[PDB]
Amino acid sequence: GQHYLNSDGSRFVPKDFYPKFSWDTTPMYYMFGDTTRLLEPEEVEFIAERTDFLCIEKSHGRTPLGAAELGAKHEAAAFKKIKPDMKVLFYFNSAYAWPFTSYNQAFTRNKIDEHPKLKSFLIVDPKTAELAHRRNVFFFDVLNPELREWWSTTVAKGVAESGCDGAFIAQMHGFAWLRADKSEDVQKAMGEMMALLKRKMGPDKILLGNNANQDIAKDAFPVMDASMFEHYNEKLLSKESLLQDWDDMLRIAQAGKMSIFRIGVESDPRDQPVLAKERAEYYLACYLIGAQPYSYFQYGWGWTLSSGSLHEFPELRKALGPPKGAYDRTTPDGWEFTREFEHASVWVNTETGNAKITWR
Numbered sequence: 001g002q003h004y005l006n007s008d009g010s011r012f013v014p015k016d017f018y019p020k021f022s023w024d025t026t027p028m029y030y031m032f033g034d035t036t037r038l039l040e041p042e043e044v045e046f047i048a049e050r051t052d053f054l055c056i057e058k059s060h061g062r063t064p065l066g067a068a069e070l071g072a073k074h075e076a077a078a079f080k081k082i083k084p085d086m087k088v089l090f091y092f093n094s095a096y097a098w099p100f101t102s103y104n105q106a107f108t109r110n111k112i113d114e115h116p117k118l119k120s121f122l123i124v125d126p127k128t129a130e131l132a133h134r135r136n137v138f139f140f141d142v143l144n145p146e147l148r149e150w151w152s153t154t155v156a157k158g159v160a161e162s163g164c165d166g167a168f169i170a171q172m173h174g175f176a177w178l179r180a181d182k183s184e185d186v187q188k189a190m191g192e193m194m195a196l197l198k199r200k201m202g203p204d205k206i207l208l209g210n211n212a213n214q215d216i217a218k219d220a221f222p223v224m225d226a227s228m229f230e231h232y233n234e235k236l237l238s239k240e241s242l243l244q245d246w247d248d249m250l251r252i253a254q255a256g257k258m259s260i261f262r263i264g265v266e267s268d269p270r271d272q273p274v275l276a277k278e279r280a281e282y283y284l285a286c287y288l289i290g291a292q293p294y295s296y297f298q299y300g301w302g303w304t305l306s307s308g309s310l311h312e313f314p315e316l317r318k319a320l321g322p323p324k325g326a327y328d329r330t331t332p333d334g335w336e337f338t339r340e341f342e343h344a345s346v347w348v349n350t351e352t353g354n355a356k357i358t359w360r
Contacts, residue, residue, distance in 0.1 A: 007326040008254070010254065016204070023321055031303060038074055039078065044078045047079075050316070056075050056091060059098070080163075094169050112131070121140060139175055142186060166206030172190055188219050191219025194207065210228045211228065211230050228260040246289055264302055272307075273301075282353060284299070285355035290327065318344070
C-alpha cells in the first residue's frame with residue numbers, strides 16, 4: 001500500500017501542486033458562496049476540518065465587500081490561516097458574464113454601452129440585433145480571439161489577486177446552439193482559451209473544468225488538472241449515466257487528473273437538509289463504486305453557503321480505507337454494484353435507487 005492505486009491496479013502519480021488525498025475517510029471537496037456575507041470564523045473551522053480542497057462561488061461577499069473576488073480573497077486567507085496547504089479555487093464562468101467581480105462590472109445594461117471593446121466580446125441575438133442574454137446577463141463569445149485573450153488574462157488576474165490556488169471554470173459549451181454550424185470550431189476555441197489560462201496562471205495552479213468529461217470539452221480536457229461531474233439533472237443520475245461516470249472516473253485517473261463527483265439533491269426524484277441527510281448513503285455509495293485516487297465527493301443541494309456545506313453528513317466521516325479492488329457488477333447485465341474497502345462494504349442498486357454501506 002505504498003502508492004495510491006487506480007482501480008485497474010496502475011499507480012496514480014499526483015502532481016506536486018495537487019491537494020492532499022487519503023482514503024482514511026471519504027475524500028471531500030466543498031464549494032459555496034453567499035452574496036450577503038462572509039463566513040463566520042466558526043464556519044471556516046467547520047469546513048476546514050472536513051476538506052483540503054474547496055472553491056468559492058461566483059458572488060461570494062459581493063454585498064459586504066463590493067466585489068466577489070474580494071470574497072474569494074477573504075476566504076482563501078481565512079482558510080489558509082488554519083490549514084496553510086488547503087487548496088482554494090477562484091470561480092469564473094466561461095459563458096455568462098456575471099457582473100459580480102470588479103473584472104466584469106461593465107457587463108450590465110447601464111454600463112456595457114460605455115465599454116465598446118468589452119461589449120464587442122459578447123454574442124448578439126440576430127432576432128433583435130441586440131446583445132444576447134439570459135435575464136440581462138450577457139454571453140461571452142469564445143470564437144472571438146480577443147475575448148479568449150481578455151478572459152484568460154482576467155481569470156489569471158482573479159487567481160493572483162485572490163491568492164487562490166487555481167480556477168474553477170464553469171461551462172464548456174460556448175453557446176454552440178446559437179451557432180450550431182460552428183460547433184466544432186467552438187470546441188476547439190474552448191480548448192484554446194483553457195490553454196491560454198493554464199499558461200497565464202503560472203506554475204503550481206489547478207485548473208478545474210466543470211463537466212469536462214463530456215465530448216464538447218475534449219479540446220479543453222488535456223490542459224485541465226481536474227474535472228467535475230456536476231450531475232445537474234435527473235438524466236445525468238440515471239443508471240446508465242452513473243455507469244458512464246465510473247468509466248470516466250477511471251479514464252480521468254489514468255490521465256493523472258483529479259475528478260470531483262458532485263451531487264445536488266435538488267436533482268433527486270423526491271425539506272432539503274432532511275432529504276439530503278437521508279439520501280447521503282445512496283449518493284456516497286454511487287461515488288465509492290467509482291472512486292479513484294485524487295477524486296473527491298461533494299454533497300449538498302446547491303451552490304450557496306446554506307446548501308449543505310455547513311451540515312454534518314455522518315457517513316462522510318466514517319473510516320473508509322483503501323479499496324480492496326475495483327467494483328463488481330454483481331450480475332453481468334444487472335444494476336447491482338459492490339465494492340470492498342478496508343473498512344466498508346458498499347452495495348448500490350442504481351436502477352432502484354437503493355444502497356447500503358456496511359461500515360466495519
